[PDB]
């Protein structure tokens, strides 16, 4: 009683395992060295540490189980009932942690540049540690619906085989559709809005200041850091859109099609696209330390001096 197994080309599977292991080692080393560096203004440090922490947790928790339980053993849950519940709870709590961290960092930069007094009053290390603990608690509360919706179900030929058991939303399609579509709706269309518009008006302020920097009498070799700030700004916004759009387009695709439209080709495309979407979310969670590293070439020096 073995069905629902998807017969893919093994060279594509080996080639995406190699990508997954490369993102694994790069994200773990980058996030480990950034937390050690930030651990050795204070609020943006705790914000970057919280986002890097959430990305390290999404890698070390989600990566090896998703690896072993979708790539190698494609059908059985290795981890049991609480394993499914804890996996989707962690995964979605980390997704809300990452999305709300990038929201908070973009509001903090918009605050830090366009409202300096209001950012002075909104920022205190007591308030920032309370705020990050609040945002981790809110990501856990918004991940409680991935606890109660999800579970085990046996979809064998008669529903009684011990290997026909899968890990699936055990609720009907309308409830599934509303829960997953409000997740993708608020968790993505609100961070795309705040990141895009805030970072756009920051980039406007920085490009006007660059055009007022080309004060050449005052200026040392320090117009590189303003262009680098424009580049890191734009790298943040573009990386967040490109890395967290296909995952929710995939979940939308799971959300709307009621199986009357599914074929074998879209079935196979969905499984390969699932692999690619988890590749992109791990590209996000691994390329945060990269594009915080490479722009701050003195903080980068601090990284490589502590590493050497």
């Amino acid at each position: 009683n073995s069905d629902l197994d998807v017969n893919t080309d093994i060279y594509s599977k080996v080639l995406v395992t190699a990508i997954y292991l490369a993102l694994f080692v790069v994200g773990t080393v980058g996030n480990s060295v950034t937390l050690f560096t930030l651990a050795r203004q204070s609020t943006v440090d705790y914000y970057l540490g919280s986002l890097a922490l959430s990305d390290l947790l999404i890698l070390l928790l989600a990566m090896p189980v998703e690896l072993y339980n979708f790539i190698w053993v494609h059908h059985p849950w290795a981890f049991g009932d609480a394993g499914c519940r804890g996996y989707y709870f962690l995964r979605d709590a980390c997704t809300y942690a990452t999305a709300l961290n990038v929201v908070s960092l973009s509001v903090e930069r918009y605050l830090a540049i366009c409202h300096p007094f209001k950012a002075k009053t909104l920022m205190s290390r007591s308030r920032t540690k309370k705020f990050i603990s609040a945002i981790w608690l809110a990501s856990a509360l918004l991940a409680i619906p991935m606890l109660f919706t999800m579970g085990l179900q046996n979809l064998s030929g008669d529903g009684t085989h011990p290997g026909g058991l899968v890990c699936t939303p055990i609720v009907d399609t309308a409830t599934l559709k509303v829960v997953i579509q409000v997740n993708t709706f608020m968790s993505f269309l609100f961070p795309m809005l705040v990141a895009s518009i805030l970072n756009t008006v920051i980039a406007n302020k920085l490009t006007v200041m660059v055009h007022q920097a080309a004060n050449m009498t005052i200026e040392p070799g320090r117009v590189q850091a303003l262009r680098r700030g424009v580049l890191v700004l734009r790298a943040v916004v573009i990386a967040f859109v490109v890395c967290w759009l296909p995952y929710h387009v995939r979940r939308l695709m799971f959300c709307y099609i009621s199986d009357e439209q599914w074929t074998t080709f879209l079935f196979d495309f969905y499984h390969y696209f699932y692999m690619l979407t988890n590749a992109l979310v791990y590209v996000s969670a691994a390329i945060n330390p990269i594009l915080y590293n490479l722009v701050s070439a003195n903080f980068r020096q601090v990284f490589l001096s502590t590493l050497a």
């Binding site: 979809l155 899968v166 799971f254 199986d259 599914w262 074998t264 969905y270 699932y274």
Partner: peptide
């Protein structure tokens, strides 16, 4: 044929 994958 519905994928259970999510």
């Amino acid at each position: 044929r519905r994928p259970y994958i999510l």
